[PDB]
Write a protein that binds this DNA or RNA. Sequence first.
RNA 1: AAACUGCGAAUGGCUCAUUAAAUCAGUUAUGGUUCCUUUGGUCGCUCGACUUGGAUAACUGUGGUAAUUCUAGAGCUAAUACAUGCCGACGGGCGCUGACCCCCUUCGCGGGGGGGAUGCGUGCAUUUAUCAGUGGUGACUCUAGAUAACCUCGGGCCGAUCGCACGCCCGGCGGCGACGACCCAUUCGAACGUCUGCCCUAUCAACUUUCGAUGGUAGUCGCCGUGCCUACCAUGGUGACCACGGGUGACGGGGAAUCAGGGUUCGAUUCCGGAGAGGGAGCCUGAGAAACGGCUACCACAUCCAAGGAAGGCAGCAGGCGCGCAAAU
Lengths: 151, 262, 206, 100
Amino acid sequence: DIQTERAYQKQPTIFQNKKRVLLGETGKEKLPRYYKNIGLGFKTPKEAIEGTYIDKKCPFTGNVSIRGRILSGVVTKMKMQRTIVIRRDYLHYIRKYNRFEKRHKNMSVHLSPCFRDVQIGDIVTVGECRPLSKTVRFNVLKVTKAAGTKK
Amino acid sequence: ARGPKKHLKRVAAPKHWMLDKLTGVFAPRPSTGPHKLRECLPLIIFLRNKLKYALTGDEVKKICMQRFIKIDGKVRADITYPAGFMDVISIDKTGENFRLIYDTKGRFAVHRITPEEAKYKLCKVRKIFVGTKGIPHLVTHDARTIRYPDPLIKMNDTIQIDLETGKITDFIKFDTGNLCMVTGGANLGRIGVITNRERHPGSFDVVHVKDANGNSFATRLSNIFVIGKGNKPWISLPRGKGIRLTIAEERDKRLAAKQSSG
Amino acid sequence: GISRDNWHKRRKTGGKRKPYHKKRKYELGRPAANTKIGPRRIHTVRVRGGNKKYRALRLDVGNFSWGSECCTRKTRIIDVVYNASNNELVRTKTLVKNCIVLIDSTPYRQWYESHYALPLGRKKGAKLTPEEEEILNKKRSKKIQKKYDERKKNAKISSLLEEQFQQGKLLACIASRPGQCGRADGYVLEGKELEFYLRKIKARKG
Amino acid sequence: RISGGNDKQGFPMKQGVLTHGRVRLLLSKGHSCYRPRRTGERKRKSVRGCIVDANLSVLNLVIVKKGEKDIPGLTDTTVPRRLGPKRASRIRKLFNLSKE
RNA sequence: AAACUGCGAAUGGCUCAUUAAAUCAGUUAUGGUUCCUUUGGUCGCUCGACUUGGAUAACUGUGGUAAUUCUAGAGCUAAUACAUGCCGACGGGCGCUGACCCCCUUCGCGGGGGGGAUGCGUGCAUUUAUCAGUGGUGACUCUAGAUAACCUCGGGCCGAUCGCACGCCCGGCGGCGACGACCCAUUCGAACGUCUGCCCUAUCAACUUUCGAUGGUAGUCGCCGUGCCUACCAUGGUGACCACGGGUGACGGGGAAUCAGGGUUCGAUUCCGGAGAGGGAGCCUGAGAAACGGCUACCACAUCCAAGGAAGGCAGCAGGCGCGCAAAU
């Protein structure tokens, strides 16, 4: 399930080759997991604690920090891997005609494999990060399901 | 611009530099120092507009390098030296000292002080650092790196330093019930007591300050200077004690002074 | 004249952008180092802020780490065997960060007999001839022998590391960028790293 | 020992050109035939090559070995010393003085 | 005076050609990096000479070319120019290796506890690897601590510099400055990013896409994040809520005119930010330049000449021609 590509995937905080007294069983083969509290009142989920995925851009198990703006949006498409596009619908005001117009500005955010219970239409919130790609700047902090989907 | 700017236009100057328009094209850009450009005051501006000791830009230079003016116990020979909040300035020969405190409006004010009060200076700690061989460090709001401080000095406290030895004598803790004043913004020079301190994670932590007569206002965390422990101030406050008289009471006071003067 | 801008290229919508200002001096790029092996040559280039960055063109030795009991010794570079980025960069003897090379096994072996007092290497049919280590074994007291015995009560390592120690070369990884600091540091490959990269080498060479 | 020279059109010769003609090249700080006006300022000049031929104006010669036939133009009077050494170690080296 | 050295010329001034989410405006962040100068700290923390070396200026003398803020050979001479570098602190501390010595129920054996000569490494600046968790943040792979090393010959620091006033105590020993220096914060900033907001046009309805378009892995380079660029993968990304394409008599904003209330038009122009010096391209020096009153080649245009060559870019201040309805010493 893991180690797909031409290089080893590891978390460069822990040491995965500690020498035990025996190197047998009963205390070994449970590797430690690196995680941190991202702050701003957000709570880390269990999937980032007991998971086995390896990332370098995950807000929980990764080398990226959260600072700046906190936004929200609705998930539109899940086609490209490990990152999704959300839609922000907002209203614009004109001084001349005292009437509003709705506008949308879709943009790409990053989805770690910690949140894999995501379908089209789920409301997510994002936080500003350093540029992780050409057009990707935001990391998803939590996921909220839409109406229905009771299964 | 391929490099740093070296000129400064007259109408691009800050308003608290308190200049005129139809005098010259340029304004005195201060040399880099402890204080920022928009929050300091050049020595030429003070000596040529406030104290009226000099009239031109050469007389200020003659007085400045004549070794007559001492800045926080050190003689300075730069005519555009940045002087900011509670910069103790001394004239040794005529025996006068001035303390720079913001008055009831948004500006500086001349304030003659006794020499016994001119020996020390209240200043605000900015951040706490740890040195090379486990030495704690303090960074002060006028960039005074002090080695080995008191263990009870926190991030937003105020320390009192003797100008002859550079060490800490006494301190004020950041807590509600202490006399405070604001340095910057719409509020400036008002003296009040801290009551509330609202914590916002990831942004500016606003506080609430009540005046001694019944007025209240809210400023940011960076716009805080603690000056007293309770009601008694540790320094000599200027005239009016920083009460921020409104325009009606100011008009009434000016009319009363005009009627009494005749 | 190599640029590093983000205005020579198309936008997110796919529409071309028109450049308005020419190439600046903070926007600069330089040609690749191509750090080879051989007698050591290092060049310095002046960068922004007046600092210097050591361009390692050729190098001989490196300061690697062996983390099973935390020892670091200066070790000669022998040969590069694998690169995860380009398959041409093994045909030309190039050194990059997170690259896979072989280093000599002598100083870690000397540290192993000088610390744990167990033989490392020294394949059967030829024993310790030049008579140095058993000189260090003798003229000891009872306390010092007790201290070594309690130390070598646990003296086990991986069998693949042992096979590399009879082979005389340890498969190593580079954790430093030679084109920026001028040196080739890193750590030796151990554990699942050894089986993964040995699987990669045996898959590529087949 | 032949050293230096000027072309018929008036171009001095750079040491190490290895050409009998005229080659244009860049000159910088610390090079001959160039006195820079700004720091780091490099300008391309045209110089004479190293190999001597018939198309030259003057030629500069030095004397390395003195013979027996003294020339009144060359060896007539010995000039006096305009100014001597200045540093203390140069005085002690010239006069062969001791420590005391 | 001259000249070497160091610093500044990257500021200021003029113009609006390019540029339609590009610039710019308000609001955020560098927990994703460099910073001349000033200010404050550090500058006997490292365990290993009462002052060293040779080159060049200015100068003297002698020359070429029709010609330039053009220059070669010859004879001296200085540094806060280029270099090479010691003594003290400095007697013992902190860790590995340790000959060995001493105390005892346990007879010795076995075990427990203290002294240790000798040998190696020692701090800050860089890099790798491992472990623990003084002070702080909403949050670190943050600072500090420990272990094992590294420490580039184009090489980190740890003062072979200068002046004024005078000197006490038996040759040693002192006061105030100037200059220079690794690191750390600050000041001036610059730079890359986050959210929102630009004139007209459908006789422009689909655009981009192994000539990177979208994302993932690992690297090169860059002061740093990032298809910025490489090698491999999947077919992604925007669009009737107007993408894309074209035009603009488009630098953007603070603002100006008119105006009951709403609006319409302009903003080349004194303050702020951006762009250029004929127009593209490349670069040395420097902290900061793709600089043009710096350099190098192309074309358009153009100056002097013994015809071999040499020398430049007023959208700076005055001035002149052209263009013009239209603008000065």
